[PDB]
Amino acid sequence: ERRALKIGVNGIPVTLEPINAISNVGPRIVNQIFDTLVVRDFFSNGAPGNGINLMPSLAESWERIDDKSVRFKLRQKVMFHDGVEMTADDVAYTFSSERLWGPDAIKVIPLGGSYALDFDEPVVEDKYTVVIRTKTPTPLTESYMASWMGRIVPKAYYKTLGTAAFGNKPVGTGPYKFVEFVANDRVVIEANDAYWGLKPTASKITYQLVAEPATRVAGLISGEYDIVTTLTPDDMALINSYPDLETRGNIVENFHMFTFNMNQPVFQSKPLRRALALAVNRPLIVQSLWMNKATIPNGFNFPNYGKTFDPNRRAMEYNIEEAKRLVKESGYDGTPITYHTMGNYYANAVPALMMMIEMWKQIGVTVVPKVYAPGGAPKDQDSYMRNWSNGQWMTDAWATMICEFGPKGQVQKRWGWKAPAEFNDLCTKVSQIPDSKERFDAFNRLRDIFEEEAPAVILYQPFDVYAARKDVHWRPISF
């Protein structure tokens, strides 16, 4: 009746602390260990899996009091996995200056400095009532609490261990509890029958790293795995020819890209970055590797942004004449430039890289692939080009143009992008006005600067495919 699930995955997070696990591979595991205050209804307003109405979870009800403050009334008798009852103190700690957004917290949780809202300290009104506050107005509080930033941690236990040690022995309120974590290999979680919500339907879940997608496909076919992730459209015909197996695929609110270590002199200025960007023939990559199912967005611009999505925005540019002109202008001396990829952690990362190496050879740039195994990522000083992705995790263009590429983000801080002052001033402005034609035009100006500066280059939104046994009716891969 409750089976032990075996999931063959593309990767394993570096930790199970819920914010530090934010990645393509962490949420599928941490969403089973932890809960949020509220959850998105992915099928509200007729949406086919990307709906946005908010529904109760750890909070049974909530009331926006003013433009800076939201009161949450918590469920009672919710138990953390170690038997401690969750209270307003735990929720307050989760969004506190100490743990999340203060100066010392940002050292151990870097996304607390860039992915946090402009929080002020939560207020605990009573055992089951907490008020989440912001120092400046924002309408995003409630939806933020359904996001990957909103997973609730146990104050006493987390504070005692600290962020890093908690990530190796996580305790949450979710339907599965931690058993084991072997870095670069596996995570095992087991049913928590003390869960406040629906009883878990699997006895145990094992997430096993299977680096190569053909090995994942073969393991599904042999019964070694019940579910496998991160496949491509090319795998679908073979899998679906087995009557006991099936695939599912769709465009995800995430883009694959490549980016630069702009602390390196070779990438300290925009010309060679933009040269590499203008030489990418995205329709050809999409045709050869994605069966024309991946979609190319019109800039850093996605429909989930709603009022800040521009459906009429122009396409991103492909111009090898300008690319060649920019290589010569940069003074590039033929010095090999590495491009680091952790295998096919991103679907089709290595075949797309090989096609782009040919494109860059045509404009006079020598790019060398540096394919590393999980756990072998280079030190920042040895990193030049690398691949990446960004999940568009809010119904607002603030994510990820601002939270990743803005003045508080990692692209400018860790990776050294010296953005124009106009860019950082507009990032500040859009975070102070409601949705209007003015806010709409400011995001389009940020998009234009992004394309001119090329701190990163958007490739496409992947057509994400997973596969499973038909008789496995619940799949904890957060698709």
Ligand SMILES: O=P(O)(O)O[C@@H]1[C@@H](O)[C@@H](O)CO[C@H]1O
């Ligand atoms: O590409 P990953 O690093 O696995 O995940 C990224 C995160 O780093 C952050 O950018 C949010 O989007 C994910 O896709």
